[PDB]
Amino acid sequence: HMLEMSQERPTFYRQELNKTIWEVPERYQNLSPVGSGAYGSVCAAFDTKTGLRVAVKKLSRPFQSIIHAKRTYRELRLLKHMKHENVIGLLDVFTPARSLEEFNDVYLVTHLMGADLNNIVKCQKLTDDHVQFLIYQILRGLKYIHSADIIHRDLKPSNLAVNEDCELKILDFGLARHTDDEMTGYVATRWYRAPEIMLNWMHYNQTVDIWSVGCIMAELLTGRTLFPGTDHIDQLKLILRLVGTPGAELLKKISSESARNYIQSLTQMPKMNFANVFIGANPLAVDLLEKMLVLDSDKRITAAQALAHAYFAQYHDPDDEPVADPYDQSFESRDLLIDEWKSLTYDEVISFVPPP
Numbered sequence: 001h002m003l004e005m006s007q008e009r010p011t012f013y014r015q016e017l018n019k020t021i022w023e024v025p026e027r028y029q030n031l032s033p034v035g036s037g038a039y040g041s042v043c044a045a046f047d048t049k050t051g052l053r054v055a056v057k058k059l060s061r062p063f064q065s066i067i068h069a070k071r072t073y074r075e076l077r078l079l080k081h082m083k084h085e086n087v088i089g090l091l092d093v094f095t096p097a098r099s100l101e102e103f104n105d106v107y108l109v110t111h112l113m114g115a116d117l118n119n120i121v122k123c124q125k126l127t128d129d130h131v132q133f134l135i136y137q138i139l140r141g142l143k144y145i146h147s148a149d150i151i152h153r154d155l156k157p158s159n160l161a162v163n164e165d166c167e168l169k170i171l172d173f174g175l176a177r178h179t180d181d182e183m184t185g186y187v188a189t190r191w192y193r194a195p196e197i198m199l200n201w202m203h204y205n206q207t208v209d210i211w212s213v214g215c216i217m218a219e220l221l222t223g224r225t226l227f228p229g230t231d232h233i234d235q236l237k238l239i240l241r242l243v244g245t246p247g248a249e250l251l252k253k254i255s256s257e258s259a260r261n262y263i264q265s266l267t268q269m270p271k272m273n274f275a276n277v278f279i280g281a282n283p284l285a286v287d288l289l290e291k292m293l294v295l296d297s298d299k300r301i302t303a304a305q306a307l308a309h310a311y312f313a314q315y316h317d318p319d320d321e322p323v324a325d326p327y328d329q330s331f332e333s334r335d336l337l338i339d340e341w342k343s344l345t346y347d348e349v350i351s352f353v354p355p356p
């Protein structure tokens with residue numbers, strides 16, 4: 001029954017990095033910008049308190065609009081909830097402000113990652129063992145994320161951080177939107193997206209993430225993008241060629257009448273033989289792929305079910321694949337003013353409890 005009734009404010013020091021003034025607790029030393037403005041405003045640093053090499057991100061204009069203030073709040077809530085080895089988590093969150101009145105900047109902290117799945121693949125030839133272990137971690141983390149009723153929505157190699165020990169973490173959740181223009185043409189931003197979400201056929205569920213894993217797995221196994229469409233339509237054709245054209249069941253599930261009309265306009269095609277598409281691949285991997293790359297999302301294998309697939313026999317441990325605590329997203333359907341979103345954010349910042 002021993003409780004803390006107050007919080008000791010750290011001593012902050014300020015310096016100019018990333019053309020901007022960074023103000024952080026003294027525990028964070030030797031800050032050096034990284035990612036070349038690509039990760040955003042991120043500085044690599046050494047957390048002297050934990051003896052950990054960390055990534056410190058400074059949110060830029062988190063409350064410049066109602067849309068952004070809510071996004072900032074959404075990100076913080078998400079990052080604070082994530083507690084899994086295969087998912088990006090929060091080591092610390094802070095602001096130099098002593099009060100809400102002076103609240104403006106938000107700094108986030110996590111483990112420093114070296115490279116994403118793309119960099120890994122570019123540097124060496126991965127063994128099936130590597131692919132096995134990599135996809136295992138993705139599904140282990142997906143099971144957790146999905147158990148909290150969260151959907152990544154933008155799962156792709158650039159959103160998977162990997163280390164020297166082939167350990168992987170899922171990051172950059174797609175909770176906001178992807179400008180339909182950055183989804184235009186011959187772009188990797190669209191190659192891993194489920195068709196139903198790429199063309200807006202219906203209300204997508206968490207299985208859209210499984211489709212993405214299938215795309216990633218196939219590519220790790222063949223070394224080739226599975227559906228490198230030059231545009232949405234070219235990509236859909238690439239997809240139906242492999243998995244066959246929709247049956248009546250799925251057809252009735254597509255809400256857009258125009259989309260339905262369009263679908264029926266295509267010459268019907270049967271599902272291809274994956275054993276002949278993925279020549280020389282492990283028969284177990286081919287089976288799993290067929291279970292993931294199913295056009296009707298309702299029949300796609302779940303992350304939980306996938307982990308129990310014989311293909312992961314060497315890594316599967318039902319007692320070591322954790323689920324998440326309930327995640328309240330009621331705020332998503334909530335309407336608030338900028339300052340109200342900002343207040344909710346500030347509340348979350350000052351109430352942060354570091355990992356044990």
Ligand SMILES: c1ccc(C[C@H]2CN(c3cc(-c4ccncc4)c(-c4ccc5ccccc5c4)nn3)CCN2)cc1
Nearest residue numbers: 039055056057108109110112113114115116158161172
């Ligand atoms: C390594 C890993 C992945 C890539 C591709 C990667 C590059 N991008 C990134 C990257 C990072 C990052 C995470 C960990 N260590 C360094 C950078 C963050 C970031 C930085 C600080 C944070 C602090 C608290 C919470 C979350 C945080 C997220 N945001 N966007 C965008 C997506 N692809 C490149 C190199």
